[PDB]
Amino acid sequence: GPLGSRVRLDFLDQLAKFWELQGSTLKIPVVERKILDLYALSKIVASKGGFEMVTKEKKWSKVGSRLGYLPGKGTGSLLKSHYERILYPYELFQSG
């Protein structure tokens, strides 16, 4: 059972399709000349305490570092905004 990127694509399909119904069109922003994670990023946030716990403790930096970002200016700020705008709202949409 080689778990490559099958689940990743399937997940994006739901988010891209669900949002498509609204008319916003899902867009994947590029950061550091690379693709911005979503599935993994979502898990890391929860493991920290949903989201607020991450900001309160400022553990957002660890989230991006785990992905594979080089110590730059402040990618953490981009991750928070990126996650809390398209991926985050997705869950709330269903659990709202």
Please answer whether residues 26 and 86 qualify as being in contact, where contact means their C-beta atoms are separated by less than 8 angstroms.
Answer: yes
CA distance 36 to 78: 10
CA distance 62 to 66: 6
Experimental approach was NMR
Please answer whether residues 35 and 9 qualify as being in contact, where contact means their C-beta atoms are separated by less than 8 angstroms.
Answer: no
CA distance 12 to 10: 6
- How many domains in the chain? 1
Give me the domain span that covers residue 59. Answer: 1-96
The CATH number assigned to the domain holding 12 equals 1.10.150.60
CA distance 2 to 85: 31
